[PDB]
Write an enzyme that holds these catalytic residues in place. Structure first.
Site, PDB file in Angstrom:
ATOM      1  N   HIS A 144     -61.490   6.160  11.593  1.00 39.73           N
ATOM      2  CA  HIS A 144     -61.452   6.028  12.663  1.00 39.73           C
ATOM      3  C   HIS A 144     -63.239   4.812  13.048  1.00 39.73           C
ATOM      4  O   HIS A 144     -63.346   4.533  11.858  1.00 39.73           O
ATOM      5  CB  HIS A 144     -61.671   7.094  13.888  1.00 39.73           C
ATOM      6  N   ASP A 174     -53.232  11.409   8.163  1.00 38.78           N
ATOM      7  CA  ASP A 174     -53.775  12.635   8.102  1.00 38.78           C
ATOM      8  C   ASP A 174     -53.207  13.117   9.930  1.00 38.78           C
ATOM      9  O   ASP A 174     -52.705  14.397   9.861  1.00 38.78           O
ATOM     10  CB  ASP A 174     -55.962  12.260   8.868  1.00 38.78           C
ATOM     11  N   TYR A 404     -55.590  -2.497  18.739  1.00 40.11           N
ATOM     12  CA  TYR A 404     -56.155  -2.755  17.180  1.00 40.11           C
ATOM     13  C   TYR A 404     -55.187  -3.142  15.750  1.00 40.11           C
ATOM     14  O   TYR A 404     -56.058  -3.572  15.377  1.00 40.11           O
ATOM     15  CB  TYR A 404     -57.278  -2.192  17.202  1.00 40.11           C
TER      16      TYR A 404
HETATM   17  N1  LIG Z   1     -62.536  15.235  22.245  1.00 45.25           N
HETATM   18  C1  LIG Z   1     -62.181  14.524  20.594  1.00 45.25           C
HETATM   19  N2  LIG Z   1     -60.650  13.727  21.482  1.00 45.25           N
HETATM   20  C2  LIG Z   1     -60.102  14.463  20.146  1.00 45.25           C
HETATM   21  C3  LIG Z   1     -60.282  13.671  18.992  1.00 45.25           C
HETATM   22  C4  LIG Z   1     -62.093  14.224  18.046  1.00 45.25           C
HETATM   23  O1  LIG Z   1     -62.207  13.779  16.891  1.00 45.25           O
HETATM   24  N3  LIG Z   1     -62.645  14.258  19.029  1.00 45.25           N
HETATM   25  N4  LIG Z   1     -59.875  13.406  17.406  1.00 45.25           N
HETATM   26  C5  LIG Z   1     -58.241  12.050  18.022  1.00 45.25           C
HETATM   27  C6  LIG Z   1     -57.346  12.169  16.810  1.00 45.25           C
HETATM   28  S1  LIG Z   1     -57.298  11.293  15.168  1.00 45.25           S
HETATM   29  C7  LIG Z   1     -56.274  12.790  16.675  1.00 45.25           C
HETATM   30  S2  LIG Z   1     -55.105  12.276  14.898  1.00 45.25           S
HETATM   31  C8  LIG Z   1     -55.696  13.674  18.103  1.00 45.25           C
HETATM   32  C9  LIG Z   1     -55.552  15.326  17.583  1.00 45.25           C
HETATM   33  O2  LIG Z   1     -54.565  15.210  18.762  1.00 45.25           O
HETATM   34  P1  LIG Z   1     -53.986  17.317  18.426  1.00 45.25           P
HETATM   35  O3  LIG Z   1     -53.489  16.846  16.618  1.00 45.25           O
HETATM   36  O4  LIG Z   1     -53.370  17.379  19.168  1.00 45.25           O
HETATM   37  O5  LIG Z   1     -54.883  18.024  18.018  1.00 45.25           O
HETATM   38  P2  LIG Z   1     -54.843  20.044  18.940  1.00 45.25           P
HETATM   39  O6  LIG Z   1     -53.170  19.404  19.526  1.00 45.25           O
HETATM   40  O7  LIG Z   1     -55.132  20.614  19.742  1.00 45.25           O
HETATM   41  O8  LIG Z   1     -54.309  20.845  17.166  1.00 45.25           O
HETATM   42  C10 LIG Z   1     -54.163  21.751  17.408  1.00 45.25           C
HETATM   43  C11 LIG Z   1     -54.383  22.956  18.578  1.00 45.25           C
HETATM   44  O9  LIG Z   1     -54.083  23.918  17.670  1.00 45.25           O
HETATM   45  C12 LIG Z   1     -55.430  24.812  17.301  1.00 45.25           C
HETATM   46  N5  LIG Z   1     -54.409  25.071  15.801  1.00 45.25           N
HETATM   47  C13 LIG Z   1     -55.072  24.784  14.269  1.00 45.25           C
HETATM   48  N6  LIG Z   1     -54.009  24.672  13.176  1.00 45.25           N
HETATM   49  C14 LIG Z   1     -52.565  25.486  14.183  1.00 45.25           C
HETATM   50  C15 LIG Z   1     -51.324  25.973  14.362  1.00 45.25           C
HETATM   51  O10 LIG Z   1     -51.395  25.583  13.027  1.00 45.25           O
HETATM   52  N7  LIG Z   1     -50.925  25.924  14.734  1.00 45.25           N
HETATM   53  C16 LIG Z   1     -51.213  26.466  16.231  1.00 45.25           C
HETATM   54  N8  LIG Z   1     -50.042  26.934  16.783  1.00 45.25           N
HETATM   55  N9  LIG Z   1     -52.250  25.617  16.860  1.00 45.25           N
HETATM   56  C17 LIG Z   1     -53.088  25.343  15.981  1.00 45.25           C
HETATM   57  C18 LIG Z   1     -55.749  24.706  17.962  1.00 45.25           C
HETATM   58  O11 LIG Z   1     -56.933  25.059  17.939  1.00 45.25           O
HETATM   59  C19 LIG Z   1     -56.351  22.705  18.481  1.00 45.25           C
HETATM   60  O12 LIG Z   1     -56.333  22.962  19.821  1.00 45.25           O
HETATM   61  O13 LIG Z   1     -57.603  13.663  18.837  1.00 45.25           O
HETATM   62  C20 LIG Z   1     -57.376  12.869  19.539  1.00 45.25           C
HETATM   63  N10 LIG Z   1     -58.800  13.394  20.246  1.00 45.25           N
HETATM   64  N1  LIG Z   2     -59.894  20.125   8.831  1.00 47.69           N
HETATM   65  C1  LIG Z   2     -59.586  19.493   9.456  1.00 47.69           C
HETATM   66  N2  LIG Z   2     -59.561  18.789   8.687  1.00 47.69           N
HETATM   67  C2  LIG Z   2     -59.478  17.639   9.127  1.00 47.69           C
HETATM   68  C3  LIG Z   2     -58.446  17.266  11.039  1.00 47.69           C
HETATM   69  C4  LIG Z   2     -58.010  18.504  11.122  1.00 47.69           C
HETATM   70  O1  LIG Z   2     -56.925  18.950  11.726  1.00 47.69           O
HETATM   71  N3  LIG Z   2     -58.679  20.119  10.865  1.00 47.69           N
HETATM   72  N4  LIG Z   2     -58.306  16.043  11.282  1.00 47.69           N
HETATM   73  C5  LIG Z   2     -58.295  15.567   9.855  1.00 47.69           C
HETATM   74  C6  LIG Z   2     -57.543  13.760  10.745  1.00 47.69           C
HETATM   75  S1  LIG Z   2     -55.954  13.141  12.335  1.00 47.69           S
HETATM   76  C7  LIG Z   2     -58.366  12.194  10.693  1.00 47.69           C
HETATM   77  S2  LIG Z   2     -58.071  11.574  11.434  1.00 47.69           S
HETATM   78  C8  LIG Z   2     -59.558  12.810  10.096  1.00 47.69           C
HETATM   79  C9  LIG Z   2     -60.462  11.711  10.245  1.00 47.69           C
HETATM   80  O2  LIG Z   2     -61.272  10.642   9.673  1.00 47.69           O
HETATM   81  P1  LIG Z   2     -62.211  10.051   9.772  1.00 47.69           P
HETATM   82  O3  LIG Z   2     -62.352   8.742   8.755  1.00 47.69           O
HETATM   83  O4  LIG Z   2     -62.927  10.369   8.316  1.00 47.69           O
HETATM   84  O5  LIG Z   2     -63.176   9.856  10.540  1.00 47.69           O
HETATM   85  P2  LIG Z   2     -64.544   9.248  11.011  1.00 47.69           P
HETATM   86  O6  LIG Z   2     -65.675  10.352  11.269  1.00 47.69           O
HETATM   87  O7  LIG Z   2     -63.556   8.354  12.004  1.00 47.69           O
HETATM   88  O8  LIG Z   2     -65.472   8.188  10.140  1.00 47.69           O
HETATM   89  C10 LIG Z   2     -65.018   6.086  10.294  1.00 47.69           C
HETATM   90  C11 LIG Z   2     -66.456   6.715   9.807  1.00 47.69           C
HETATM   91  O9  LIG Z   2     -66.849   4.832  10.001  1.00 47.69           O
HETATM   92  C12 LIG Z   2     -68.438   4.410  10.823  1.00 47.69           C
HETATM   93  N5  LIG Z   2     -67.979   3.555  11.756  1.00 47.69           N
HETATM   94  C13 LIG Z   2     -67.552   3.636  12.434  1.00 47.69           C
HETATM   95  N6  LIG Z   2     -67.251   1.764  13.156  1.00 47.69           N
HETATM   96  C14 LIG Z   2     -68.025   1.374  12.316  1.00 47.69           C
HETATM   97  C15 LIG Z   2     -68.283   0.372  12.966  1.00 47.69           C
HETATM   98  O10 LIG Z   2     -67.832  -0.480  14.131  1.00 47.69           O
HETATM   99  N7  LIG Z   2     -68.903  -0.178  11.163  1.00 47.69           N
HETATM  100  C16 LIG Z   2     -69.121   0.055  10.289  1.00 47.69           C
HETATM  101  N8  LIG Z   2     -70.069   0.077   9.243  1.00 47.69           N
HETATM  102  N9  LIG Z   2     -69.391   2.048  10.108  1.00 47.69           N
HETATM  103  C17 LIG Z   2     -68.621   2.260  11.703  1.00 47.69           C
HETATM  104  C18 LIG Z   2     -68.636   5.902  10.966  1.00 47.69           C
HETATM  105  O11 LIG Z   2     -69.967   6.281  11.871  1.00 47.69           O
HETATM  106  C19 LIG Z   2     -67.979   7.399  10.486  1.00 47.69           C
HETATM  107  O12 LIG Z   2     -68.657   7.517   9.509  1.00 47.69           O
HETATM  108  O13 LIG Z   2     -59.977  14.086   9.794  1.00 47.69           O
HETATM  109  C20 LIG Z   2     -58.582  14.723   8.981  1.00 47.69           C
HETATM  110  N10 LIG Z   2     -59.417  16.380   8.593  1.00 47.69           N
HETATM  111  O1  LIG Z   3     -56.415   9.287  13.069  1.00 49.74           O
HETATM  112  C1  LIG Z   3     -54.928   8.351  13.137  1.00 49.74           C
HETATM  113  C2  LIG Z   3     -55.397   7.919  13.902  1.00 49.74           C
HETATM  114  C3  LIG Z   3     -54.547   6.512  15.205  1.00 49.74           C
HETATM  115  O2  LIG Z   3     -54.285   6.006  16.512  1.00 49.74           O
HETATM  116  C4  LIG Z   3     -54.846   5.744  13.618  1.00 49.74           C
HETATM  117  O3  LIG Z   3     -54.893   4.441  14.262  1.00 49.74           O
HETATM  118  C5  LIG Z   3     -55.362   6.336  12.804  1.00 49.74           C
HETATM  119  C6  LIG Z   3     -55.486   7.253  12.009  1.00 49.74           C
HETATM  120  O4  LIG Z   3     -55.525   7.412  10.798  1.00 49.74           O
HETATM  121 MO   LIG Z   4     -56.207  11.693  13.576  1.00 50.69          MO
END
Ligand SMILES: Nc1nc2c(c(=O)[nH]1)N[C@H]1C(S)=C(S)[C@@H](COP(=O)(O)OP(=O)(O)OC[C@H]3O[C@@H](n4cnc5c(=O)[nH]c(N)nc54)[C@H](O)[C@@H]3O)O[C@H]1N2
Ligand SMILES: Nc1nc2c(c(=O)[nH]1)N[C@H]1C(S)=C(S)[C@@H](COP(=O)(O)OP(=O)(O)OC[C@H]3O[C@@H](n4cnc5c(=O)[nH]c(N)nc54)[C@H](O)[C@@H]3O)O[C@H]1N2
Ligand SMILES: Oc1cc(O)c(O)cc1O
Ligand SMILES: [Mo+4]
Ligand code: SF4
Ligand code: SF4
Ligand code: SF4
Ligand SMILES: [Ca+2]
Ligand SMILES: [Ca+2]
Lengths: 875, 274
Positions: A144, A174, A404
């Site tokens: 992100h 991811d 984007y």
């Molecule tokens: N506030 C906030 N909003 C976000 C983000 C964020 O970092 N912060 N991330 C954004 C991004 S990149 C994405 S990809 C989407 C993520 O969106 P999603 O992937 O939809 O996140 P959750 O659906 O809630 O996924 C699992 C839910 O199930 C539970 N869970 C975890 N593992 C399991 C499992 O094996 N089985 C079941 N049944 N439940 C499980 C957890 O408590 C969680 O609430 O969110 C987006 N929205």
């Molecule tokens: N245990 C567990 N781990 C997970 C997941 C889960 O459900 N469970 N979710 C997975 C998923 S879906 C995702 S998407 C990843 C999160 O994946 P991400 O890549 O790891 O994490 P972000 O926090 O979005 O980090 C973006 C970085 O970019 C920097 N940044 C943002 N905007 C700018 C900018 O304009 N300029 C510069 N120079 N830097 C910038 C921020 O400060 C930040 O450190 O986590 C994954 N890991």
């Molecule tokens: O977290 C995911 C979700 C998005 O919408 C994207 O553009 C990149 C990613 O890794």
């Molecule tokens: Mo994601």
């Protein structure tokens, strides 16, 4: 010196009105529409009522308190250089992060000028390029980024990097893991990385929904993505219509806490036991859509025999499922029966796909299990589909505005979705040109983000697929190696941001890699001094989107999530005004790259003589916006609410498939060559393949993979409580979903206001500790009380956390959000317990399957205890 | 003489903390001459109370955003020695300057909504963003809480006491600690979710969840509530005061009854196998 001016900007948490005075931000608020100049909203008539959205936008918590991030004291103040690093002498690679190892990160650095910082980086770039080649320069931002289309990583970052190096640490899918490496083989949708389309489902649901099963779905918390709380009122409408809401999640998530009629808490990695028992019930009671299945499924007969236990000897009964998951057999069967007779929508994940369950050791079978259930009930027909209630808003899909992901100013057709439409609109092959990369391509060299540590420290690796393999179902099966044939191993690492210690897997390894002697130079181009930043040799201060000019649309990602702006109640296009001058000595990423371009003698090619605002105007003219207003007019207004398109014919997601006719939605696939006469799914047979033909081919070619069978079966999760030998030492099952009060690392730490939220961090003796939720029963057995500092650990590391005793978890299950932005080791970096809260230190780095090279984070076994105060320097 | 009033729906709080973040956004880095100095990090002018009820797997949780009650019969004003005053529109404000050096003010609050700011050496609390309400330029004409909500929890209004009184009766609005007589102007809808308790259970007949079983709740022998079990065979009787009750169940002509003691806790009888 002046008056307050209301400006506009946006974020990953929604658009905002920014009130500024004397060069200072006073407040940031949600947006109110002015009915005198803003187009009317859509309306939906259903079941005797008229539904219309509020004339306003909404924001996420982390956006509400974003001002504290802009003015954070952890903001990188100016270019910095590691004292122990001498470009022309001792580079002391082993001293990277030494400050961190002695709990004093800042002491490792000294202030330097922008001129000197850039000269040092340029000297390294040029030396390495002439000695080893551009491939020796590794670089990677992360998933992100600050909101803004022109400055987004797919745009500015790629435009510059493609002209400089480089080896990209391509990102694993991811967000989509299970759907990408698993579901894709079953129903296609490669262009959506396995997720289904969701067009026009809101009206369909308001008219026909009787029940919604939220499986691994927390719409309120995630909002799908980037959509604040836009969908809250919609579930309110459904609820008042009498629609039942059932939640299946180990943790009683925030949406469930608000509107659940029933909540199931399966043990980690056991969801597919529930889907198999539900299917079993439907087969035994003949309660599914046989006609639909007979016409739209492949290999169903064989699959049914497996579900019935004829082939393996174990009927997948609700009792069998209870023993696996802990969820009462009677309730599973009750849900099964209700699901069969009522118009039920399956909300798998918060987006309509995704879901934490998909990135776990059972992620592949969970995703296929969701597809199997939706299929058996005839997805696509009225009242039956996969819908998570976040998408499907009747917005004008015919109006075009780039997300984007479409590349912005890079025009990179291989690493962004620019090729679909935007590139052709943005560039003319005459006066403005794209920036392609001949290295970040399959025949070039890239390494997996999930295995950067192994490539750096081991110097070799072999894997499947390149980043997001959305081109076709089998692209992810292609084999790659590092170093790539003829290319060089990495010598330099240009980091953009530094969140990996909190976002990847078994992360202590990311801390260990920085001190490897093969790494000659590490540059960090970031906004805040946190996470991995304190391991760099040179640090370059970037600014937030509130300190530069840009343009964007509310939640519009597009690309691998075509038309996802339908997550919002209105399509809002806004000018991201430069509200204030850059804080400290930071500068926009574009200006940083422009400075490097000048020193690399490629300024004209990179900038084309344009500043950020000039690119914004060109960008603007490449969209459909000119049809409504000129750049000057848009710049002055600041935002535009796209008009409703009342008369367009509705095309409900998958209805064309359910009815066996030509695809008629605005989806970006399937491609014509993946269909016979524009009908059917992208799969070979054009049907839902319970026995995947692509995987059968793969396994017959010799790529044997026990944890990714061609047929959807009950593969025991390799990191679960009853199938992993590790469960003896670490009996507790931990899931670590996305942070409730932060957009991943963007919100947490940084001395932001979010740290004062009761359910985000708990202050103990002056330090705000990350939270871990434990069931009262497990806490009691360990003498743990609410608020106590505990130590969560396994073979991968130790993390100090504040305990929150709750009833929102089945005994034996623990919960703690991922994405902690703070890495604060009690001892040597990468070798001791962390108190910052980086739960991903404990998650498994093993790939979901042998060839499914995705992360399996949400299934991790741990043990917890009251912290005795030790630093545990044993890793 | 129209007054301000706020209505908070507990059943709609999800605890996203958009409010809280809104105060801080408005008060942590800004100073508002005549109303308040900057807020101290850690203060909770807007304090979102959290309360879990019951036990796994039939537990639940509700939240109660809690700002200043700006009560009509305010104890601060009475015992604030002029350091706290009440405006005609109902807003109760601490005098930023007269209050300096007086920690005692905090104790004049039965609700404990004021906090001591160490840097400013003064008590601080909810101002109902009077500085915003007093400025026509603030188009929303409502406080930051109410404006930042994405969950439709807040209903901010300016009306007559009579009109508000009428609304109270129609919606069954309640205030916190009525017995004290301070007469809050901040009302709560569905407050029972936070202040009361429930009893629940799942009925099984021949091993399967039984839908349509008739359930009755009696206190002292007389019916206090009734319902039919849903498809999960469950029922839930909420808004119960402490005391002893009897639950009577009739499914397929089969009967079951048992007593339950509610003591500031909600009870899950578990699976009832008939
Ligand atoms: N506030 C906030 N909003 C976000 C983000 C964020 O970092 N912060 N991330 C954004 C991004 S990149 C994405 S990809 C989407 C993520 O969106 P999603 O992937 O939809 O996140 P959750 O659906 O809630 O996924 C699992 C839910 O199930 C539970 N869970 C975890 N593992 C399991 C499992 O094996 N089985 C079941 N049944 N439940 C499980 C957890 O408590 C969680 O609430 O969110 C987006 N929205
Ligand atoms: N245990 C567990 N781990 C997970 C997941 C889960 O459900 N469970 N979710 C997975 C998923 S879906 C995702 S998407 C990843 C999160 O994946 P991400 O890549 O790891 O994490 P972000 O926090 O979005 O980090 C973006 C970085 O970019 C920097 N940044 C943002 N905007 C700018 C900018 O304009 N300029 C510069 N120079 N830097 C910038 C921020 O400060 C930040 O450190 O986590 C994954 N890991
Ligand atoms: O977290 C995911 C979700 C998005 O919408 C994207 O553009 C990149 C990613 O890794
Ligand atoms: Mo994601
Ligand atoms: S913003 Fe609304 S839903 Fe969120 S915590 Fe405050 S009152 Fe509750
Ligand atoms: S809640 Fe307390 S601070 Fe507010 S008006 Fe009432 S007594 Fe005074
Ligand atoms: S009314 Fe203003 S001062 Fe009171 S809690 Fe709400 S945002 Fe804060
Ligand atoms: Ca059905
Ligand atoms: Ca609730």
């Amino acid at each position: 010196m002046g008056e307050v001016v209301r400006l506009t900007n946006s974020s990953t948490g929604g658009p905002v009105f920014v009130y500024v005075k004397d060069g200072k931000i006073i407040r940031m608020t949600p947006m109110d529409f002015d009915d005198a100049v803003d187009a009317p909203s859509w309306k939906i008539e259903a079941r005797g009522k008229t539904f219309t959205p509020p004339r306003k936008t909404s924001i996420a918590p982390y956006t509400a308190g974003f001002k504290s991030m802009i003015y954070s004291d952890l903001r990188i103040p100016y270019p910095m250089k590691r004292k122990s690093f001498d470009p022309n002498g001792e580079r002391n690679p082993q001293l990277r992060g030494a400050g961190l190892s002695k709990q004093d990160p800042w002491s490792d650095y000294e202030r330097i000028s922008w001129d000197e910082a850039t000269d040092i980086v340029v000297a390294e770039i040029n030396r390495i390029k002439h000695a080893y080649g551009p491939s020796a320069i590794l670089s990677t931002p992360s998933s992100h980024h600050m909101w803004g289309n022109v400055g987004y990583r797919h745009s500015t970052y790629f435009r510059f990097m493609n002209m400089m190096g480089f080896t990209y640490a391509d990102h694993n899918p991811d967000s989509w893991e299970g759907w990408h490496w698993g579901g894709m083989h079953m129903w296609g949708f490669s262009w959506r990385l396995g997720n289904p389309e969701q067009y026009d489902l809101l009206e369909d649901g308001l008219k026909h929904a009787e029940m919604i099963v939220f499986w691994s779905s927390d719409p309120e918390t995630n909002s799908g993505i980037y959509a604040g709380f836009e969908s809250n009122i919609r579930r309110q409408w459904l609820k008042d219509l009498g629609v039942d809401f059932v939640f299946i999640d180990p943790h009683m998530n925030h949406t469930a806490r608000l509107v659940a009629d029933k909540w199931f808490s399966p043990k980690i990695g056991t969801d597919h036991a529930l889907s198999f028992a539900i299917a079993y019930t439907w087969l035994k009671e003949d309660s599914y859509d046989k006609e639909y299945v007979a016409a739209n499924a492949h290999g169903f007969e064989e699959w049914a025999d497996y579900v019935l236990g004829k082939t393996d000897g174990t009927p997948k009964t609700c009792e069998w499922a209870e023993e696996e998951s802990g969820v009462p057999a009677c309730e599973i069967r009750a849900l099964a029966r209700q699901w069969a007779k009522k118009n039920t929508y399956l909300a798998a994940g918060g987006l309509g796909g995704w879901g934490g369950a998909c990135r776990a050791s059972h992620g592949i079978e969970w995703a296929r299990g969701m597809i199997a259930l939706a299929t058996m009930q005839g997805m696509g027909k009225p009242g039956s589909n996969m819908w998570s209630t976040t998408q499907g808003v009747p917005l004008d899909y015919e109006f075009y505005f780039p997300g984007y992901a479409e590349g912005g100013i890079s025009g990179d057709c291989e690493n962004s979705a620019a090729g679909f439409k935007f590139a052709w609109r943005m560039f003319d092959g005459k006066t403005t040109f794209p920036s392609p990369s001949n290295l970040n391509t399959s025949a070039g060299q890239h390494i997996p983000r999930l295995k950067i540590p192994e490539c750096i420290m081991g110097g070799k690796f072999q894997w499947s697929g390149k980043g997001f393999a959305g081109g076709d179902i089998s692209h992810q099966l292609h084999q790659y190696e590092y170093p790539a044939p003829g290319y060089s191993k990495i010598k330099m690492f240009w980091k953009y941001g530094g969140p990996h210690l909190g976002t990847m897997t078994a992360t202590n390894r990311y801390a260990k890699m920085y001190t490897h002697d093969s790494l000659e130079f590490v540059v960090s181009q970031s906004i805040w001094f946190e996470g991995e930043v304190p391991f760099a040799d040179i640090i370059l201060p970037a600014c937030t989107n509130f300190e530069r000019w840009d343009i964007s649309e509310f939640a519009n990602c597009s690309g691998y999530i075509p038309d996802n702006y339908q997550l919002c109640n209105h399509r809002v296009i806004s000018l991201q005004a430069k509200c204030i001058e850059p804080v400290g000595e930071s500068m926009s990423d574009y200006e940083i790259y422009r400075l490097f371009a000048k020193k690399l003698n490629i300024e004209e090619m990179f900038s084309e003589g344009k500043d950020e605002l000039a690119w914004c105007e060109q960008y603007f003219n490449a969209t459909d916006m000119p049809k409504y207003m000129t750049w000057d007019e848009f710049f002055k207004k600041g935002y535009f609410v796209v008009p409703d398109n009342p008369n367009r014919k509705k095309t409900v997601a998958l209805r064309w498939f359910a009815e066996g006719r030509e695809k008629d939605t605005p989806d970006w696939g399937p491609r014509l060559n993946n269909q016979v006469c524009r009908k059917g799914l992208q799969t070979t047979t054009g049907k839902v393949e319970f026995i995947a033909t692509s995987l059968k081919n793969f396994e017959e070619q010799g790529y044997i993979d026990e944890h990714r069978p061609s047929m959807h079966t009950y593969v025991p999760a390799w990191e679960s409580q009853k199938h992993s030998p590790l469960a003896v030492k670490y009996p507790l099952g931990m899931l670590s979903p996305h942070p409730r009060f932060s957009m991943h690392t963007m919100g947490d730490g940084k001395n932001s206001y979010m740290n004062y939220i009761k359910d985000h961090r708990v202050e103990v003796d002056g330090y705000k500790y990350w939270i871990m939720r434990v069931n009262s029963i497990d806490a009691e057995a360990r003498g743990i009380k609410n608020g106590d500092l505990i130590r969560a650990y396994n073979d991968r590391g130790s993390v100090i956390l504040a305990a929150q005793v709750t009833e929102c978890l089945q005994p034996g299950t623990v919960h703690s959000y991922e994405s902690c932005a703070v890495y604060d080791p009690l001892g040597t970096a990468g070798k001791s317990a962390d108190r910052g809260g980086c739960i991903n230190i404990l998650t498994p780095d093993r790939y979901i399957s042998k060839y499914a090279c995705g992360m399996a984070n949400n299934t991790a076994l741990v043990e917890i205890e009251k912290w005795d105060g030790d630093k545990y320097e044993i890793y | 003489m129209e007054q301000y009033y706020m209505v908070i729906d507990v059943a709609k709080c999800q605890d996203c903390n958009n409010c809280f973040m809104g105060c801080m956004d408005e008060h942590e880095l800004n100073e508002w001459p005549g109303y308040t100095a900057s807020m101290q990090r850690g203060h909770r002018w807007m304090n979102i109370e959290r309360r879990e009820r019951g036990t796994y797997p039939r537990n639940d949780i509700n939240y109660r955003p809690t700002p200043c009650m700006h009560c009509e019969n305010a104890p601060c004003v009475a015992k604030g020695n002029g350091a706290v005053y009440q405006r005609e529109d109902g807003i109760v404000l601490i005098d930023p300057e007269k209050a300096k050096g007086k920690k005692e003010l905090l104790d004049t609050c039965p609700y404990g909504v004021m906090y001591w700011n160490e840097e400013e050496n003064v008590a601080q609390k909810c101002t109902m963003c009077a500085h915003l309400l007093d400025d026509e330029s603030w188009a929303p004409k409502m406080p930051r809480c109410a404006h930042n909500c994405g969950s439709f929890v807040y209903e901010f209004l300016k009306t007559t006491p009579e009109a508000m009184a009428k609304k109270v009766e129609e919606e069954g609005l309640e205030v916190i600690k009525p017995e004290l007589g301070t007469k809050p102007r901040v009302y709560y809808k569905n407050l029972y979710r936070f202040e009361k308790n429930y009893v629940t259970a799942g009925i099984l007949v021949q091993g399967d969840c039984f839908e349509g079983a008739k359930v009755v709740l009696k206190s002292g022998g007389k019916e206090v509530a009734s319902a039919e079990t849903n498809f999960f065979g469950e029922f839930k009787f909420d808004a119960l005061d402490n005391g002893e009750y009897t639950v009577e169940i009739d499914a397929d002509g089969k009967s079951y009854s048992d007593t339950v003691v509610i003591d500031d806790k909600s009870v899950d009888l578990g699976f009832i196998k008939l």
